Enzyme design. Sequence first.
Site, PDB file in Angstrom:
ATOM      1  N   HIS B  10       0.820  -1.217   0.000  1.00  0.00           N
ATOM      2  CA  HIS B  10       0.000   0.000   0.000  1.00  0.00           C
ATOM      3  C   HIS B  10       0.859   1.274   0.000  1.00  0.00           C
ATOM      4  O   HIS B  10       2.009   1.266   0.457  1.00  0.00           O
ATOM      5  CB  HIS B  10      -0.963   0.008   1.192  1.00  0.00           C
ATOM      6  CG  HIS B  10      -0.275  -0.049   2.518  1.00  0.00           C
ATOM      7  ND1 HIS B  10       0.269   1.072   3.123  1.00  0.00           N
ATOM      8  CD2 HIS B  10      -0.045  -1.088   3.356  1.00  0.00           C
ATOM      9  CE1 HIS B  10       0.840   0.716   4.261  1.00  0.00           C
ATOM     10  NE2 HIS B  10       0.648  -0.584   4.438  1.00  0.00           N
ATOM     11  N   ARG B  61      -6.256   0.752   3.214  1.00  0.00           N
ATOM     12  CA  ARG B  61      -5.013   1.307   2.680  1.00  0.00           C
ATOM     13  C   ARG B  61      -4.538   0.501   1.470  1.00  0.00           C
ATOM     14  O   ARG B  61      -4.033   1.080   0.482  1.00  0.00           O
ATOM     15  CB  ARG B  61      -3.908   1.407   3.744  1.00  0.00           C
ATOM     16  CG  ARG B  61      -3.385   0.079   4.342  1.00  0.00           C
ATOM     17  CD  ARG B  61      -2.806   0.485   5.693  1.00  0.00           C
ATOM     18  NE  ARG B  61      -2.181  -0.547   6.514  1.00  0.00           N
ATOM     19  CZ  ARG B  61      -2.765  -1.167   7.542  1.00  0.00           C
ATOM     20  NH1 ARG B  61      -4.068  -0.975   7.817  1.00  0.00           N
ATOM     21  NH2 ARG B  61      -2.050  -2.026   8.274  1.00  0.00           N
ATOM     22  N   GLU B  88      -2.239  -7.149   6.750  1.00  0.00           N
ATOM     23  CA  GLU B  88      -1.018  -6.921   7.493  1.00  0.00           C
ATOM     24  C   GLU B  88      -0.919  -7.869   8.695  1.00  0.00           C
ATOM     25  O   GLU B  88      -1.938  -8.350   9.225  1.00  0.00           O
ATOM     26  CB  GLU B  88      -0.979  -5.457   7.953  1.00  0.00           C
ATOM     27  CG  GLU B  88       0.306  -5.030   8.701  1.00  0.00           C
ATOM     28  CD  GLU B  88       1.538  -5.194   7.795  1.00  0.00           C
ATOM     29  OE1 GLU B  88       1.927  -4.221   7.120  1.00  0.00           O
ATOM     30  OE2 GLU B  88       2.067  -6.305   7.687  1.00  0.00           O
ATOM     31  N   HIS B 183       0.246  -5.717   1.972  1.00  0.00           N
ATOM     32  CA  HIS B 183       0.874  -5.071   3.107  1.00  0.00           C
ATOM     33  C   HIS B 183       2.303  -5.584   3.313  1.00  0.00           C
ATOM     34  O   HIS B 183       2.674  -6.631   2.790  1.00  0.00           O
ATOM     35  CB  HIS B 183       0.035  -5.330   4.378  1.00  0.00           C
ATOM     36  CG  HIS B 183      -1.392  -4.896   4.250  1.00  0.00           C
ATOM     37  ND1 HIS B 183      -1.840  -3.677   4.717  1.00  0.00           N
ATOM     38  CD2 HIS B 183      -2.475  -5.518   3.718  1.00  0.00           C
ATOM     39  CE1 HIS B 183      -3.135  -3.561   4.456  1.00  0.00           C
ATOM     40  NE2 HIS B 183      -3.547  -4.665   3.854  1.00  0.00           N
TER      41      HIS B 183
END
Lengths: 229, 245
Positions: B10, B61, B88, B183
Amino acid sequence: MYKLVLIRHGESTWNKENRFTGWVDVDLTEQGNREARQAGQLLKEAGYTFDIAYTSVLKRAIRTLWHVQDQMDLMYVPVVHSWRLNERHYGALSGLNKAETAAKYGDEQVLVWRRSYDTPPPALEPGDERAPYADPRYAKVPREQLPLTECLKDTVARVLPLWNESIAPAVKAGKQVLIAAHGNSLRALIKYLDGISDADIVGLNIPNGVPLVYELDESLTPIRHYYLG
Amino acid sequence: SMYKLVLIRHGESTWNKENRFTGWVDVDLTEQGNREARQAGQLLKEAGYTFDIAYTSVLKRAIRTLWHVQDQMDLMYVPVVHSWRLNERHYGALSGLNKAETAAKYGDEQVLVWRRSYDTPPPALEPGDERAPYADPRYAKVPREQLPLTECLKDTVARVLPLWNESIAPAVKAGKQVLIAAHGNSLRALIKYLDGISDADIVGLNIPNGVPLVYELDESLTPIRHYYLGDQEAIAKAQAAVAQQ
Ligand code: NA
């Protein structure tokens, strides 16, 4: 009791110019962006949520959906992009405004087209730049199903399969469904939902970027419908 | 045959910028992060890339990074799979804390263990913490016992790989052009597996925000090589900066 939410894309550049668009992939204006964000805010404040959305392959509807998702914090839900939700195909009128259409075809023929459920506008030539055949959006669509023009009857016929294939089973399954699409593809659904006649559906106005809520009974028959905001 | 797989972390997030542990907290892009993602999309478009499908996480994100890429490439209509398995690494009770303040409080070594020990996780969220994932509609299909209250990278690897095995690898093998927008740690996890990197070595892998990362894979899906798209000198600077944080 189920709820199904429909929304027409926000103002596009060609809406602003009063030009027939059809399958031309034009984007939103800043106003259309604002309408879409406002619609997202309205659904959120009125307590709506969604499990899945159905939209077209045209970015004016997709970007509207993005704003609604963004404003509702639903950017993670599955989305189906279907050519069957595309705006009506306007053949050779795509790109013309009202004056240009009147000039090329005359007022009487425009009046017939405007009123007639089953008379299509002049077709694109298969080799025209605007034809769908080379477009990667339609690569897996059988070539014979791709329109070079549509009367509203054609549009309805190719929108409605999505009802039994996808939307109705999702609704019956308890999914909260949003459909972010176009004036004429939304007319097709509404035509079927409310049993509207060929003659009356032609005149149904659906404003840009305003959530339209259908309440449906166990059999998916409308109890009532209303716009938010 | 050779297959091309594109990965992208991201764009800069608000908490990247504030120097805070994020994990599963659903923070957004800064304006810089938006610009990185748009640039990423422009670069991919200019280099003649296209995608049949994208995989992303349920975190905005990454998803907004994907949207910018799709917007810039004129691919807003392509299939997208959003999977919690690309989230993430879960940062536990550290989520939301400033990294410097945390190091001041617990010592540098201790934070570095929590940050980069392969097999030892950060302190766990309590299950009744508002940050816990149990009532979040994003995870409503995940069985409760599989939802983490914290993760080390090893845990992240275990939950990432079934998505690779069951969905992504088959799609690459079928000749689909795949983009993964995700991520730092979920990409490290996948790359650890692709490049066969050891537990000790994976520690130093530093992926910059918002830079397309292309893997060339052979017929067995073993990397031939990888490289980043764009200004190579700016990418080297971005790599040095990530490594320092
Ligand atoms: Na969470």
